[PDB]
Amino acid sequence: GSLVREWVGFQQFPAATQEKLIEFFGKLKQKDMNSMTVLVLGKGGVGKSSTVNSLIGEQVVRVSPFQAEGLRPVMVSRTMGGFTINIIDTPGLVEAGYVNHQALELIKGFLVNRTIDVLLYVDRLDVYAVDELDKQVVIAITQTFGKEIWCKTLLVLTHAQFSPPDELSYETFSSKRSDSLLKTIRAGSKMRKQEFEDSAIAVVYAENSGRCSKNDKDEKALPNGEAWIPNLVKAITDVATNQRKAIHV
């Protein structure tokens, strides 16, 4: 009785987002790609589940303030028009004051005979933190995966609609928060520091909350003004298309 699931969530996205999303995917189909596997890593409570639930369009993955449990990666697979998109929602990687290696390989296991196209690294925008337990996370990642991971990676900051209190210019605030994070990755995963500049990772901002508010065509927009879901897949898409090796060997 099961083959996969009909992306009922898509029919749910506003028109401008539907037709925009139909474009990006149309690209892969033509490049002989009728599937896309996205992974999602990061610390707990950053907004992995919230975001995935956002992209697919339904309540697939469960969100939670206390994301101290979980402990087993779930894959979400929806299809339509002959195209299949799947996201792997990985459990938090920080387990009480430190990286959780138990689960980190539990992830490395979930994907043994698989192929990854895009990896999403999430953290929160509303954080001003010089997080270095952070620097740890960035290491463990390169430890399990490695060289290919960051080239096929993307940085997502959630709570993209965080009004920086008492001091301004969300743009002056956003970058410092993006830069450092990028900086921690260029530096943390030792390989990249000079070469980092060679390819560049890039960032995408997201606002999963139901209070995000809209725009002309009723699609979740950022303060910046554009739709984050639509342009977010654009990114997952460009990365899925650029022919680097993929999480391999």
Ligand X SMILES: Nc1nc2c(ncn2[C@@H]2O[C@H](COP(=O)(O)OP(=O)(O)O)[C@@H](O)[C@H]2O)c(=O)[nH]1
Q: Which residues bind ligand X (CB under 6 A)?
A: 44-51, 63-65, 67, 92, 158-159, 207-209
The beta strands (E) that lie in 68-223 are given as 74-80, 83-89, 118-124, 153-158, 203-206
Q: Is 49 in the site for Mg ion (CB under 5 A)?
A: yes
Both tokens assigned to 114: 């698989």
**CB neighbour list of residue 110: distance below 8 Å, 6 or more residues apart:** 72, 73, 75, 88, 90
What are residue 142's phi and psi, to 5 degrees?
-60, -30
Residue 90 near Mg ion by CB under 5 A:
no
**H or E stretch including 178?**
helix 170-188
In the complex with Mg ion, the residue whose CB is nearer, 62 or 190, is: 62
Binding mask 29-48 for Mg ion (x = CB under 5 A): -------------------x
Nearer to ligand X, 70 or 188 (CB): 70
Q: Residues at the annotated binding site for GTP?
A: 45-50, 64-69, 159, 207-208
For residues 67 and 189, which CB has a smaller minimum distance to ligand X in the complex? 67
Closest by Cα among 206, 201, 164 to 183: 201
With CB cut-offs between 5 and 8 Å by kind, which of Mg ion, ligand X, none does residue 77 bind?
A: none
Q: Which does 63 bind (CB under 5 to 8 A by kind): Mg ion, ligand X, none?
A: ligand X
Residue with tokens 């779930």: 74
Residues that bind Mg ion (CB under 5 A): 48-49
